[PDB]
Structures are given as C-alpha cells and as structure tokens.
Amino acid sequence: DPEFGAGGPWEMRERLGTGGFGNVCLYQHRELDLKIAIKSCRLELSTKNRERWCHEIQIMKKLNHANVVKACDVPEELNILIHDVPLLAMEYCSGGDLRKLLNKPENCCGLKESQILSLLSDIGSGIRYLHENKIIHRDLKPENIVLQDVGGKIIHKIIDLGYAKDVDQGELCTEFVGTLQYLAPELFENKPYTATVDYWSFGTMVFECIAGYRPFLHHLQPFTWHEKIKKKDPKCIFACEEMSGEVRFSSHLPQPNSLCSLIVEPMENWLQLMLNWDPQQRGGPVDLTLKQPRCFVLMDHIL
Amino acid sequence: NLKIVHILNMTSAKIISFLLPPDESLHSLQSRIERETGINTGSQELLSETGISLDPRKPASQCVLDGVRGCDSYMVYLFDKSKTVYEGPFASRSLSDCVNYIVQDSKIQLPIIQLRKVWAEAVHYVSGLKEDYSRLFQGQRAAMLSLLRYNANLTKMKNTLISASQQLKAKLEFFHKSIQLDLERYSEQMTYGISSEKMLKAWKEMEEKAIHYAEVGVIGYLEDQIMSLHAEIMELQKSPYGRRQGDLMESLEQRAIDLYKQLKHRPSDHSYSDSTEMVKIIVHTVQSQDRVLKELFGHLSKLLGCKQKIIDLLPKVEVALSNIKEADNTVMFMQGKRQKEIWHLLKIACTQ
Amino acid sequence: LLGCKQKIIDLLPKVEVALSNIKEADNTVMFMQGKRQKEIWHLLKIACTQ
Amino acid sequence: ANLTKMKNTLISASQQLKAKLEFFHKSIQLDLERYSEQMTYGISSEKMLK
Ligand SMILES: O=S(=O)(O)O[C@@H]1[C@@H](O)[C@H](OS(=O)(=O)O)[C@@H](CO[C@H]2O[C@H](CO[C@H]3O[C@H](CO)[C@@H](O)[C@H](OS(=O)(=O)O)[C@H]3OS(=O)(=O)O)[C@@H](O)[C@H](O)[C@H]2O)O[C@@H]1O
Ligand SMILES: O=S(=O)(O)O[C@@H]1[C@@H](O)[C@H](OS(=O)(=O)O)[C@@H](CO[C@H]2O[C@H](CO[C@H]3O[C@H](CO)[C@@H](O)[C@H](OS(=O)(=O)O)[C@H]3OS(=O)(=O)O)[C@@H](O)[C@H](O)[C@H]2O)O[C@@H]1O
Ligand SMILES: NC(=O)c1cc(-c2ccccc2)cc(-c2ccc(S(N)(=O)=O)cc2)c1N
Numbered sequence A: 001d002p003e004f005g006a007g008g009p010w011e012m013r014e015r016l017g018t019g020g021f022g023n024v025c026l027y028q029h030r031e032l033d034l035k036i037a038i039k040s041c042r043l044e045l046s047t048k049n050r051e052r053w054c055h056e057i058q059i060m061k062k063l064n065h066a067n068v069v070k071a072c073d074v075p076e077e078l079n080i081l082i083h084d085v086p087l088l089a090m091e092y093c094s095g096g097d098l099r100k101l102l103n104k105p106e107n108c109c110g111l112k113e114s115q116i117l118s119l120l121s122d123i124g125s126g127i128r129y130l131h132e133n134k135i136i137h138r139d140l141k142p143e144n145i146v147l148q149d150v151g152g153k154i155i156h157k158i159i160d161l162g163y164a165k166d167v168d169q170g171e172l173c174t175e176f177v178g179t180l181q182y183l184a185p186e187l188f189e190n191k192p193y194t195a196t197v198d199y200w201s202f203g204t205m206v207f208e209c210i211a212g213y214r215p216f217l218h219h220l221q222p223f224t225w226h227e228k229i230k231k232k233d234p235k236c237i238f239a240c241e242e243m244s245g246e247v248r249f250s251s252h253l254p255q256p257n258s259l260c261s262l263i264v265e266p267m268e269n270w271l272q273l274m275l276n277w278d279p280q281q282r283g284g285p286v287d288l289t290l291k292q293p294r295c296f297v298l299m300d301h302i303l
Numbered sequence B: 001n002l003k004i005v006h007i008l009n010m011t012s013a014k015i016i017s018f019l020l021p022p023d024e025s026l027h028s029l030q031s032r033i034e035r036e037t038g039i040n041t042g043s044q045e046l047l048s049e050t051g052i053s054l055d056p057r058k059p060a061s062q063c064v065l066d067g068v069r070g071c072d073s074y075m076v077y078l079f080d081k082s083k084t085v086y087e088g089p090f091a092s093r094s095l096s097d098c099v100n101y102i103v104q105d106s107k108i109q110l111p112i113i114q115l116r117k118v119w120a121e122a123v124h125y126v127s128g129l130k131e132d133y134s135r136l137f138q139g140q141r142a143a144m145l146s147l148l149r150y151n152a153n154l155t156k157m158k159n160t161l162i163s164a165s166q167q168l169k170a171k172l173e174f175f176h177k178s179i180q181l182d183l184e185r186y187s188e189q190m191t192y193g194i195s196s197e198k199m200l201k202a203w204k205e206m207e208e209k210a211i212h213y214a215e216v217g218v219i220g221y222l223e224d225q226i227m228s229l230h231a232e233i234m235e236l237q238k239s240p241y242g243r244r245q246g247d248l249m250e251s252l253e254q255r256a257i258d259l260y261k262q263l264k265h266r267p268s269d270h271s272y273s274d275s276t277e278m279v280k281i282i283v284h285t286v287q288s289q290d291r292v293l294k295e296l297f298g299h300l301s302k303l304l305g306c307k308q309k310i311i312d313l314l315p316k317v318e319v320a321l322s323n324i325k326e327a328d329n330t331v332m333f334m335q336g337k338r339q340k341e342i343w344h345l346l347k348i349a350c351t352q
Numbered sequence C: 001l002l003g004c005k006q007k008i009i010d011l012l013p014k015v016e017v018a019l020s021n022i023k024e025a026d027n028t029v030m031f032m033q034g035k036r037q038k039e040i041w042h043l044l045k046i047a048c049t050q
Numbered sequence D: 001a002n003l004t005k006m007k008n009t010l011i012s013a014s015q016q017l018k019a020k021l022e023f024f025h026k027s028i029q030l031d032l033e034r035y036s037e038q039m040t041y042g043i044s045s046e047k048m049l050k
Helices: A047-062 A098-103 A113-131 A197-211 A264-274 A294-302 B026-034 B096-104 B112-187 B199-212 B220-236 B246-264 B276-333 C002-031 D002-036
Strands: A010-015 A025-029 A037-039 A088-090 A145-148 A155-158 B005-009 B014-018 B044-047 B076-080
Touching (some): A047 A088, A098 A145, A113 A294, A197 A264, B005 B112, B076 B112, B096 B276
Antiparallel strands (some): B044 B076
C-alpha cells in the first residue's frame, strides 16, 4: 500500500522480494501496457538515511547495461512516498528470481549445461560492468538475480544495489544484511574489505547452479559454516558432511552435474580462483594483456 | 509507586504518556501536552472514559486508578477544540523487516525456527490494529457522552428560559390591565377629582415600554432551534458508531491466531518452511483497518461538530434570560410609578 | 400496557383540577387589580370637593 | 403524549400564577407602607383597613 490516492492511472499488482519496508512493487498500467516496477520508500527514513536513498537512484541511472537492473525514468506518478523521498523506477521481469530456477525439482541436483553457462555469460558480464563504474555489489545473492524472457532465451540480470558500495558521494550503504549465506568472508569481520568480494558471491552461485547446493556446508548456518572451513584448503571448492557427521574437503566438482567431460577441466579451476578465502588473492593473476584477472580470463576462455 | 497517565490523542491516534508528580496540577500538565501535540493550552479539552470533560478543580491527581490494577487502563482522550473535523494526522506502527518478508515475498520458504517469530509478531500486529481500534472507538463514545451532557445542560436552561418568559408575559398582562386601568379612571375626572399635566406623559410612557418588550415569543429563534439540534443529536445516535464493524476485524484476529496456533501445535517443527498463508490475514486486516478507521472519524465529525453548535447557542440562552429578567425587573418596580405616584399625588387637598 | 392506560386516564381528570385551580387564582388575582387600584380613585375625591 | 401535552401547559399556566402573585405581593403591601405614613396627614380609612 504505497498510498498515492492520485486518481488511479497506473496500478500495482504484487510486491517484490528484498529491499525494505514495502519495497518495489509490480506497477502495471490499467490503461497502457507498461508494467515497469518502482521502489516505494519505507516509513520515515532518517535524515541521515535520506541521502542514502537519493544516492541509490543516482548511481542506478548510471547503469545502462541492459544485462542488469535498469533504471528507467519515473513515470507521471512522481510525488514522494513516506516523508520527503522520491522513487526508483526500473524494468520489470516476470522470469522471477534465480531462486525459482534453483528450487525447480527438475534441476533438483544442478541445473542444465545450457542455463549454467547462460548465467556466466550474463551475470559474469554484468558483474564486470558494475566494476567498470567503481560500483561493487557484494550482496550478490541468488535472490537478487531476476530473469526475463527477452525474445526467446532467458536473460539473467543483477538487481538491487541498496547495499552495494561505491566511491562517489555515498561510501557504502549498510553494514549487516539479512540471512547471509552467499557473501565473501570479508564483511564477516568488518575489516578492510576489497573489490574481490563480488567474485566470491558470483562463484558460490555458479557452483550451486551445477550441484544444487552451497559449495561448503549446505543448510548450515554461516555462523559455524565458517569456522569449519575457516582455513578451507587451497583451491578447495567443496566440503560436505559425511553420513557419520564427519567433514570432508575436496577441490573437485561433485557429481552428478550437467557439464560435459570437457568443460569440467576449466570449470573446476575457475571456481578455484573464485573460491579462495584470501581476498586480495582470489584471481590475483591480473594479466595486463586483457586488463582483467585470471577470473574473467578462464570465463571468456570457456564461453 | 508512580502515576504515568496515558493520554490518547483523538486527533492523531497517538498515546503520549506523562509521569505526573504528586504535586503538579492539570493546568501545569496541559502545558506539557501542548509541547507534544501543538494544541493550544486553552483548546485542550481532555475527556475521560466516563465522557466527562476535564477538571480545572482538582490537580493532576485525577487519573490514579486503584480498583482494577492501576496501569494501562484509565487512559484519557485528548480532544481539540479548534479542529472541527479530524483529517488524518494519525499514524500507525510498521511490521518491521521481520514481517516485511511475509508481505513482500509473500510465498517464501523460511525456517520455522524463525517463523515462530515473524508469524508471532505478525499476529500481534494483526490483533494490534484491532485492539488499537477499540481505543480510538472509545474516544468517540466518550466524546458522545460529552455531547449528550452538553445537550442536557443546554436544554435544562431552555425549560427555565421559557418558564422565565412565562413570568414576563404573565406580568405584562397584569401590567397592561393596570396601566390603562388608571387612564380610564383619570379621563373621567380631569375636572372633578384630580387632574395635572406633568404625569400626563410620565404614565403614558410605561404603557409603551411594556410594548417594545415581550421576549416570550422571541424564544422562537431558540425553541425551534434547540429542538432542531436536540432531536438531531439523538438522531445522530441512530447512525452506526464505529465498533459496528470492529467485530468484522476481530474475526481477522482469530484467523491469525489460528495460524500461529498451527505453527507450534502442528506435527513437528524445527524444519518447517512456509509463510504464504499468513499473507492472507495480514492483507485483510490492513484493508479493514483503514476503512473503518477514517470511517470512525467521519461519524465523529458530526458528533464533535454538534458540541460547538450547543456551546454556540449556550450564550444565546443567557441573552434571553437577561433580557426577559431585565423587563421582569423593570416592570416589577414600575408598580411604584403606577401606585406610589398616586399617594405622592394625593395630599394635594389633604392640607386645605 | 393495558394497565398504564387507566393510570393515565385516572390522572387525566387531575389535570383539569390543576388547570382550573391555577386559572381560578389567575383570574381572581387578575381582577384584584381594581380592589388595589380602582379603590384608590374611589377614595380620592375625599377632598376633591372641599 | 396527550397527558404530557397538558403538563407542559399546566406548569406553564402555573408560571403565570406565581408570576402574578409576585407582581401582586409587591403591589398589595406597596399600599400599606404608603398608607401607614399618612394615617394622620392625608386620609385614614378604617373600613378598608381590613
Ligand atoms: O511447483 S511446480 O513445479 O509443480 O509448478 C511450478 C510453478 O508453481 C511455477 O509457477 S510460478 O509459481 O513461478 O508462478 C513454475 C514457473 O514457471 C516455469 O514454467 C513456465 C511454463 O508454465 C507453463 O505450465 C504451467 C503449468 O502447467 C502453466 O500454468 C503455464 O500457463 S500460465 O500459468 O503461464 O498461463 C504454462 O506457461 S506457458 O503457457 O507459457 O507454457 C515457464 O514459462 C517458466 O519460464 C518456468 O519458470 O514452475 C513450476 O511449474
Ligand atoms: O483470502 S481471499 O483473497 O481468497 O479472500 C479474501 C477473504 O479472506 C476476505 O475476508 S473474508 O471475505 O473471507 O471474510 C475478503 C474480505 O476482505 C476485505 O474486506 C474489506 C472489503 O469488504 C469485502 O467484503 C465485504 C463483505 O464482508 C463486501 O461487502 C465488500 O464489497 S464492497 O462493499 O467493497 O463493494 C468487499 O470488498 S471487496 O469486494 O473489495 O473485497 C476490505 O478490508 C478489503 O477489501 C478486504 O480486507 O476478501 C477476500 O475475499
Ligand atoms: N523490476 C523487477 O522486475 C524486479 C525487481 C525486484 C526488486 C527490485 C528492487 C529491490 C528488490 C527486488 C525483484 C524482482 C523479483 C524478485 C523476486 C521475484 S519472485 N516472484 O520471488 O521470484 C520476481 C522478480 C523483480 N522481478
């Protein structure tokens, strides 16, 4: 209930996932055919927090990469939600979030090769774009990757940056988040983080999009899901718990998967540099030939 | 060992509390309220559950309850005098990020270990709006009593106003047949008994004086106006208060309860995953709330409006009384200028 | 209900009693104005002919 | 209603009585004072004394 009470031009259908107190809502136009969703401001945002909201919309309009969440201009219905605060209009995608495709029984044990790689060429490009604007989104969790049937194929797109950090007017946005599970161990110490924090989030998901679960201890609270893998052997990309509750580590790719007997060799190695506890060490090899690290190197070498 | 008097603002649905000391007076408190309300210290008419108005007499120790318990019960309802009608300055409580998932994500599989809270708080919010509505409703009920009392107070003077006038008309008659009663007994002796000229006009004035008077009928602008309002008030008593639909909301309450009930008593937990169902009760309660909410204020605008209408006619009552009593006194002492003036004009020959 | 009627009809005559009694004095005292005024004029020419 | 309709006129009719009694009690004795001060100067009637 964003209030409005301004006649009734447009009309919202359903709300969305994360964001905050009454975040974005599926805004469709009863008259026209546009269904672009816009974000609704929470209650009485603090005076200091006010600059945070006006900040998001700022950098959001800077992102024009149609491969991720786009920031379309706000419609005739501007005004201001709860207290003095604008809005955040953006493209809508009925393809649902990534968690949908992940929870699908058909991909109960790792999605299919097509969708898999189709996520790297997508999220991998968008995640890179954000890095080309000094915009780092660490909260890159599955429930933040919307899908769309642009034409015929599924198009993955990153979304929501109300948490991501930047460099311009508005360093960071929020310290803690909600039910963490897919984030580099950097923010877990509140210590000097890096820009590789995103590589971890992306890597972890890529793994799950092949196995069907976390790269370490699934369904295990990150609290202890950390100390158990605190050391996490080098190049390790897996660690489940044996039937006897025991713990086993491995730098290989579990079975069954969906990758061919060839894409495995590179996929494993890739995940290795993307899943390295040491921050400034994940993909350290920054070949000055492509301006990008060994992380994006293998990726492009695969796709 | 404290006071802490809860005050419900029937203009913003706020519940500001004031820990009053065993010395401060209400006139010393009214000012405090003005700092967290903005209502003029003179326009701060606080009504209690009994519907009774404020109480400039007693100090600030007129809210200490010691019968049922003495906490979160005897809450006063602050009413504004200036504001004829109440718009929407009122506000409510949020569901916090804890319940937001239940409403924003709707269908989400969250661990019961967490659901036992997000659902709990959700249920508390549901019943919250409900129980919160009752508080607001009572304000109308209290304000109603104030209006019902003002109507009686206003009418009580009407019965004495028309009764006071009946004396005027009764005296005017016993005056009009007494003032001219001398004229006839005079015109037949303007040469025999006694006859002057200075009182020829002196007396002729008294007769014309009682004429311009007559306020017994002037009560018309009042009688048919105090009743048009009197019946109007009792006629507005017919309309639906607000709690009329409050029950419909209470039904929603029981619903949420049933869900939280099937959240613990359900076959095992510590692994359950679901929340889409709760969305049901959640959304419905919201809609029902805002509907009867501003609706209650509507049926109140009329009630709150009739008061000023009674208080506006209140002064007009004294006007009638004073005017009717004015002549009631003048004509009364006019008995001397109609009798005593005969004895003063009697010894004209009592000394010849 | 049927009993209250006779109770009203029983007090009905008592009303005419009040009216008649109140109007009785209302009339007497009314014309008493002469015995209080006219009796002064009748007792006025006591020396208006000396 | 019929019974009460007369009540409103009954008390109203009485209000006239009390109103007249007052405008009579201050008129009847109003002559007594003007008389007692002239029982030997103007005229002292004895037949109207009662
Ligand atoms: O849990 S189940 O596996 O049993 O069912 C899932 C659905 O709950 C879920 O729908 S939803 O909850 O996300 O809204 C879908 C997600 O969609 C996926 O499948 C559609 C194709 O759906 C086709 O088949 C369904 C079921 O028979 C029909 O209801 C659809 O018709 S309609 O409802 O759209 O009108 C039908 O769509 S179609 O006519 O275009 O073929 C894909 O388009 C999506 O890309 C998938 O994500 O997942 C489970 O089915
Ligand atoms: O869960 S569902 O969406 O499947 O069904 C909803 C019901 O749970 C919910 O409660 S109930 O009907 O099961 O008891 C209803 C009603 O909730 C709405 O209540 C009012 C609006 O009143 C609606 O219902 C009344 C009768 O009780 C009708 O008279 C209203 O029609 S009208 O007067 O507006 O013309 C009807 O309004 S509606 O047609 O817009 O629904 C409001 O608080 C909200 O509209 C709801 O909370 O809603 C679903 O059926
Ligand atoms: N503009 C959008 O299309 C959009 C925006 C959001 C969103 C925007 C800002 C903050 C958080 C979420 C989420 C989803 C989504 C989130 C979850 C789902 S669902 N039904 O849970 O799979 C569907 C889409 C969006 N589609």
